[PDB]
Ligand SMILES: O=C(O)/C=C/c1ccc(NC(=O)C2(NC(=O)c3ccc4c(C5CCCCC5)c5n(c4c3)CC(=O)Nc3ccccc3-5)CCCC2)cc1
């Protein structure tokens with residue numbers, strides 16, 4: 001069936017992406033899906049369903065569901081917002097209760113969704129390729145989104161780990177992700193790895209995929225109202241429905257994955273895992289270890305020789321294409337783990353204070369830096385820079401640029417103690433910058449504060465990126481960090497800890513860094529989300 005049908009009504013508005021590029025995105029995401037399933041697919045599905053059979057899921061109350069709403073979640077077309085939802089205002093609660101009643105009473109009627117162009121910031125790259133068109137966001141009304149949480153919040157936050165075990169990427173800190181990847185690479189006699197890029201994953205998700213996904217959820221022990229809501233949400237919302245623009249006009253019809261529903265992340269992970277695990281069998285890949293984050297997939301296996309590995313990747317791709325997951329860029333076998341990019345990241349090596357070889361996740365800093373510059377220039381509720389400092393804390397660029405830059409601004413504005421909103425792959429947090437040392441030690445290890453002897457390629461990538469962007473060189477950042485370190489230490493308390501742990505790299509006469517006294521429960525900085533709510 002067609003992933004999308006359009007009426008002609010434009011995707012109207014509410015470098016940076018706008019509605020002016022939506023037309024180009026529509027062309028890319030609009031195609032017919034031809035899915036052919038086989039025994040391997042059926043076999044993996046039964047195996048996944050047998051694991052889901054062990055899960056018991058709770059049905060959340062309206063209030064518990066309200067308390068999980070992102071503070072910045074899009075407003076309801078029925079006179080209430082995320083603030084009203086989080087405060088349990090009578091208008092919000094009463095409207096949500098009537099939505100819930102309709103989900104239990106009406107099993108067929110498609111639920112309306114809003115189609116919108118995403119405003120994302122990317123960097124002005126005129127060399128190998130041009131600009132990117134805006135992504136398309138599809139979401140139901142706020143009321144429906146609170147109802148999804150009642151029926152499925154417990155499912156989506158318990159089922160994936162039960163079904164996929166160690167293959168489920170979202171259960172990991174960046175430190176645990178590198179450990180998993182390195183351990184899996186070390187455990188192969190002759191390792192080979194590859195990342196699989198699916199072209200427009202959301203668009204490739206068929207009605208059958210969404211029904212197979214529901215067949216997995218149905219395996220949980222569920223409250224009857226939860227069982228009916230999952231059934232009603234599958235037919236009325238998840239499989240597809242009408243698209244309405246910002247001006248309230250009939251835009252078209254969706255028959256694929258909506259990006260803004262609670263099950264997007266869980267569903268894409270399950271669907272990606274199922275197709276990939278079945279494709280590994282069809283390709284006859286030996287001893288696979290997979291890691292799945294939504295549509296993002298890495299496979300690590302035993303090499304069967306250079307030519308044989310090229311042929312097995314073609315068979316993997318053939319199988320994925322049959323399952324309705326065609327490639328964007330054709331996968332390539334890699335025989336060095338650093339060369340694989342997964343979750344926009346790659347493993348690199350450095351050394352800690354003791355001289356020990358340590359592995360960490362890094363990426364091209366262009367996008368993180370350009371996004372941080374934009375945030376410095378304009379008022380933004382979500383601070384991608386804080387997310388980036390937290391997730392890439394061991395990197396040369398997050399340590400020397402982002403940490404130095406933001407701690408200097410925060411010291412100057414007297415805002416070190418001010419809690420900031422932070423979104424990481426749909427999990428919302430509220431973090432005071434003064435608490436960053438303890439968080440970094442939990443997420444990455446004590447070594448994140450003493451990494452040095454970075455790879456030359458990595459050093460060159462940061463240095464070339466700064467030149468390209470007009471950012472002062474690393475020498476300027478070292479000077480600037482010595483200043484910030486001095487003003488932080490002079491303050492004592494948490495500010496001194498920041499100075500000590502975060503900026504030890506900037507000094508010639510380094511301090512010996514021991515485990516932090518305040519280290520640890522992360523879901524304490526938790527406020528809303530876990531890959532679902534707006
Ligand atoms: O010794 C040498 O050989 C080199 C010396 C040298 C070269 C350039 C400077 N620049 C500056 O002092 C100023 N800018 C900066 O000191 C600056 C700081 C952060 C900057 C960022 C990001 C970095 C990550 C955090 C957010 C800010 C960008 N740009 C920055 C410029 C350059 C810029 O203007 N915009 C962008 C655009 C995209 C990406 C990055 C940038 C301050 C006022 C005058 C301009 C200073 C010294």
Ligand SMILES: COc1ccc(CNC(=O)[C@H]2CN(c3ccc(Cl)nn3)CCN2S(=O)(=O)c2ccc(OC(F)(F)F)cc2)cc1
Pocket residue numbers: 169170171172173174175177265293342343345361390391422424425426427429431439443522523525526530531
């Ligand atoms: C390229 O490398 C990668 C490494 C890990 C990942 C996967 N991990 C994450 O996306 C984050 C956010 N998480 C999510 C997200 C979606 C869903 Cl469905 N479920 N959980 C919880 C677990 N992690 S986490 O990193 O452990 C963490 C925990 C507490 C924090 O709290 C505080 F902010 F306070 F630090 C902050 C971070 C993805 C990429």
